[PDB]
Amino acid sequence: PTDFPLPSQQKPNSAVDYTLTTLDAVANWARQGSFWPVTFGLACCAVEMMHVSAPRYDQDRLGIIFRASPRQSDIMIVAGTLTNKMAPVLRQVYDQMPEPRWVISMGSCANGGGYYHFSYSVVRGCDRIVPVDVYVPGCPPTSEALMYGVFQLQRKMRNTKITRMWYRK
């Protein structure tokens, strides 16, 4: 041993990838296609969430078919404001959830505390509790807004590059 060949390599950015872009994009497309959450659904922002299950901006035209069970879930839409009282239950839900997990902060109150933020009993953003991958702004964000955040999350999924990260790109 005792010597080194390894040169200055690129960032995780490539195009010469035999078969690993294809296999990784197949698995990533499978993960990007079905994509069901579990409702946590605390307040008004859950009323807009169930408006995404309404026929105007349907979830099932995309694949979003949420179960009420934290093991059968993928992403965990925190909607509504988040009390001080809730947050251990939320993190306990978060832990019993399989490893490819993401969090959507749906609603201004869910990220950076939002419209209350100055209560004794509110948590100043779920960043104090769970790691979040896509924020969603505003009191109640539009069903448009929640779907736009969902498509931005899937656009993030399209850059996960997990198989070629096993190859250490």
Partner: peptide, 12 residues
């Protein structure tokens, strides 16, 4: 009739 709006392509 249905009522879906293809949200990337159409808007409420």
């Amino acid at each position: 009739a249905p009522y879906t709006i293809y949200y990337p392509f159409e808007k409420g």
